[PDB]
Amino acid sequence: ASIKDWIVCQVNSGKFPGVEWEDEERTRFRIPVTPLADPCFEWRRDGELGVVYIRERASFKGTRGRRRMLAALRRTRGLQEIGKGISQDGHHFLVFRVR
């Protein structure tokens, strides 16, 4: 299926912390990208999604699973990287809008 439909489903499942909708109309979502060495790194948040992407679509080393997932997300026209930010807790994330 489409990678757009995939990530959207992961956001809608609510089983990945940080992988969440940002607005009430559910048109843009966040993707945790906190670096490994970052003190606030949290696997279930900044790593697990990347690995799930591999199972479904040696990628278990570091955050390579995520590194690949992002590439694919930044490639599909259905999505648009609109921004990023570090939350008050220190969690790094990206923001993608759905067209």
Side-chain angles (χ1 to χ4, degrees), residues 8-90:
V8 163
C9 271
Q10 309 315 326
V11 168
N12 279 319
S13 58
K15 66 196 178 189
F16 301 99
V19 188
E20 57 188 7
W21 293 109
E22 198 177 57
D23 53 336
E24 303 181 27
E25 27 277 289
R26 304 182 196 177
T27 69
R28 64 174 178 278
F29 52 85
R30 290 182 172 178
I31 300 293
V33 294
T34 299
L36 276 164
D38 192 313
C40 302
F41 181 88
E42 176 177 339
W43 176 259
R44 62 179 178 179
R45 164 187 292 274
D46 305 281
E48 180 60 17
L49 177 64
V51 164
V52 169
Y53 170 80
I54 301 299
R55 297 179 197 148
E56 299 188 346
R57 307 292 293 196
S59 318
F60 282 81
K61 291 198 244 172
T63 47
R64 298 183 183 184
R66 184 186 73 197
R67 192 271 308 165
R68 268 166 175 170
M69 182 188 66
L70 292 181
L73 293 173
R74 281 166 165 160
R75 196 191 325 282
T76 187
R77 295 175 61 261
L79 303 169
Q80 170 183 344
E81 189 176 5
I82 167 169
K84 61 179 184 180
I86 299 175
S87 69
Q88 50 263 68
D89 309 327

